[PDB]
Design a protein around this ligand. Structure first.
Ligand SMILES: Cc1cc2nc3c(=O)[nH]c(=O)nc-3n(C[C@H](O)[C@H](O)[C@H](O)COP(=O)(O)OP(=O)(O)OC[C@H]3O[C@@H](n4cnc5c(N)ncnc54)[C@H](O)[C@@H]3O)c2cc1C
Ligand SMILES: N[C@@H](Cc1c[nH]c2ccccc12)C(=O)O
Ligand SMILES: N[C@@H](Cc1c[nH]c2ccccc12)C(=O)O
Length: 630
């Protein structure tokens, strides 16, 4: 009887296959001849874009230990080349066929295929990814479209990439949406670049709910009155968050687009622009699009005629070339039959950690948990360890399964509360999920085992990337010691992030929101850093057109668009003329922290002074309990 069948092999399955090979666990992979969207994109020469996620969060530990030198955003080409390199390693273990049906029995499954070949396996892992409406726009994308009006009903990373590609052809862009959360993918800390995933310090949730809520939520929830922030200048960007019924923030189910702010884009790419564009570094600054009117927001119920293909806004009846109905992702699951008869019904919340379904025996889901920020790699690497342990260690399998239903209820209570299921329930803060799995497996760190201030920075401020949990113990990867060292040396041991928590520990939510926006450049959607880059934008558009052999007349003036922008930007044309604690507090804080790096915590003196009380309390956080684990 085959011990393990893995169904689907692209990106998610890679770390699990690595661990099964290491422990010489008998396994077979079944994966479609057709491959993935990355194959559609490769074949048709449209791997001409870049990830919305950092190298550190997007490649697996066992690659980073070799290949990490600096933080950067990988290209689509680099991500695909890495899939292909791992496929080549394991191709002999891959049967090229398509699973049509799985019949699940008490201790095995029967797997049916398009060819007709059937397989029996004790343990079955699904790593088949998602179907996505929007993939055709990307894979079949036509750039000879010019001066046309596009209407999007949803903002997501796919819409943002499409928009990035349309705008340089003077395509006009209308978003008819119920608001969206956009976040600069790279930010300044005292004029050094940090990818946003570097600044989440998620284990601060263990100090308290309320404290972590203040570290994180002012850029998302409409909390500051600062007229510089995109959600004040363009309030149609705001959302109905009335659904949120959890003290865990950011909540499970929050999705965000990560985008290049034009100032950071300029800093990286100004000096070899055309070459950086051809590599896939595309300017996708939605905030700059709103600023410049290249995109407009209209209310969610701005009526439109689908027969005449018209949107009417103010007094112009705008004909549109295309309505984009907005991305929805659904797992590519074959039919699964409970005791080989009753269709399994898939729902994220009814699975433990997005991995273990109820009423199935020895079936696991790998790659169906989506990270709020950072790459999928963080999520699938930890899921792969979790699955590997469940398959290979009956003691662990029994420990998790014995109370599976209670664990799932306690997880759902903690992260969703009373909210009804939503299509984005599968979206999680990466540094809660990785930590959650680490504590289930037992490869977590204990806060009480911190000895020095250096140790508290590593526990609380060092990002919860999967490789954090592969330094020592059961899943240790060779070279993680040197990788952690490089990362720490290049980011001042995450002292800046740590002193953010020190600065706001005494503030209420309104005070922390004001302080967040008191910077010369606050982290996200700072509309003061847009006007200065108008000339660079024109250089960018001409560089984009040069790389993609486009010609269009800006001497040709779409006078109708110019008119609808005015109407859309009315709140902005009032709010912006009304336009630095954080910078100074962080500057002072870092100096203090970097000065006591190697000081013993437990022995730090009594009697700032209460910032020492606080630092000593970090050995005994009071919100450490997670009832789906204990
Ligand atoms: C446009 C785009 C951009 C993305 N950008 C990023 C990014 O910036 N950062 C990031 O971290 N992630 C990104 N992702 C998400 C994620 O990394 C990809 O979706 C990735 O391909 C997921 O890998 P996977 O292995 O889960 O699924 P896939 O890569 O889709 O591989 C699954 C494989 O299973 C096969 N298969 C499916 N069903 C069956 C079956 N029944 N039988 C046999 N074989 C089957 C498929 O043919 C496929 O080859 C992006 C996704 C898309 C679409
Ligand atoms: N804590 C950092 C970074 C940050 C806040 N909210 C976020 C949401 C997602 C990612 C990063 C962040 C800050 O206050 O600026
Ligand atoms: N185009 C993809 C992007 C994506 C999916 N999952 C991700 C995880 C991390 C980063 C990007 C993604 C989508 O939004 O459907």
């Amino acid at each position: 009887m085959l011990e393990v069948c893995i169904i689907g092999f692209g990106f998610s399955a890679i770390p699990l296959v690595r661990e099964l090979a290491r422990t010489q666990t008998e396994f077979q992979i079944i994966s479609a001849e057709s491959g993935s969207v990355w194959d559609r994109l490769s074949e048709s020469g449209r791997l001409d874009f870049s990830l919305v996620s950092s190298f550190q969060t997007s490649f697996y530990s066992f690659d980073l230990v070799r290949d990490y030198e600096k933080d950067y955003y990988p290209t689509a080409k680099q991500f695909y080349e890495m899939h292909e390199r791992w496929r080549s390693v394991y191709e002999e273990k891959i049967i090229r066929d398509f699973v049509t049906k799985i019949e699940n029995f008490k201790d095995y499954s029967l797997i049916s295929t398009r060819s007709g070949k059937t397989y029996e396996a004790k343990h079955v892992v699904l790593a088949t990814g998602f179907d996505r409406l929007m993939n055709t726009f990307l894979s079949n994308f036509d750039n000879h479209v010019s001066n046309k009006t596009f209407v999007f009903d949803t903002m997501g990373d796919s819409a943002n990439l499409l928009i990035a590609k349309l705008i340089p052809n003077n395509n006009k862009i209308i978003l008819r949406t119920n608001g969206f959360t956009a976040l600069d993918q790279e930010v300044q800390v005292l004029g050094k670049p940090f990818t946003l995933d570097q600044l989440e310090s998620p284990n601060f949730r263990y100090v308290s709910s309320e404290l972590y809520d203040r570290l994180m939520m002012s850029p998302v929830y409409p909390r500051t009155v600062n007229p510089a922030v995109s959600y004040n200048q363009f309030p149609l960007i705001r959302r109905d968050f009335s659904w949120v019924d959890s003290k865990s923030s950011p909540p499970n189910g929050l999705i965000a687009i990560k985008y290049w702010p034009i100032d950071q884009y300029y800093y990286h790419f100004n000096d070899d622009l055309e070459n950086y564009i051809s590599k896939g570094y595309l300017l996708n600054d939605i905030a700059m699009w709103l600023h410049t009117g290249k995109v407009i927001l209209v209310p969610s119920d701005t009526p439109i005629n689908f027969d005449k293909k018209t949107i009417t806004y103010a007094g112009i009846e705008r004909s549109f070339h295309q309505y984009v109905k907005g991305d929805a992702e659904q797992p590519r699951l074959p039919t699964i039959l409970i005791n080989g008869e009753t269709p399994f019904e898939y729902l994220y919340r009814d699975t433990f950690m997005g991995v273990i379904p109820q009423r199935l025996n020895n079936i696991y889901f790998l790659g169906y948990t989506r990270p709020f920020t950072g790459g999928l790699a963080n999520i699938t690497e930890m899921q792969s360890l979790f699955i590997h342990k469940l398959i290979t260690q009956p003691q662990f399998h029994q420990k998790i399964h014995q109370n599976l239903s209670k664990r799932i209820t306690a997880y759902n209570q903690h992260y969703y509360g009373a909210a009804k299921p939503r299509k984005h329930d599968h979206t999680v803060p990466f540094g809660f999920y990785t930590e959650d799995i680490a504590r289930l497996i037992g490869i977590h760190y204990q806060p009480n085992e911190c000895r020095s201030v250096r140790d508290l920075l590593f526990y609380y401020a060092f990002p919860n990337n999967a490789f954090k949990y592969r330094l020592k113990g059961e899943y240790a990867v060779d070279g993680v010691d040197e990788l952690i060292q490089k990362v720490n040396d290049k980011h001042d041991h995450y002292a800046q992030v740590f002193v953010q928590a020190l600065s706001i520990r005494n503030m209420n939510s309104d005070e922390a929101a004001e302080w967040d926006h008191s910077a010369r450049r606050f982290a996200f959607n700072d509309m003061r850093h847009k006007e200065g880059y108008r000339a660079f934008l024109d250089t960018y558009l001409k560089a984009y057109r040069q790389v993609e052999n486009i010609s269009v007349d800006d001497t040709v003036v779409d006078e109708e668009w110019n008119f609808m922008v005015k109407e859309a930007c009315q709140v902005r044309d009032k709010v912006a003329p009304n336009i630095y604690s954080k910078d100074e507090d962080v500057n002072k804080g870092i100096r203090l922290i970097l000065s006591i790096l190697d000081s013993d915590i437990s022995s730090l003196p009594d009697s700032e002074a209460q910032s020492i009380e606080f630092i000593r309390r970090l050995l005994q956080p009071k919100n450490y309990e997670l009832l789906f684990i204990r």
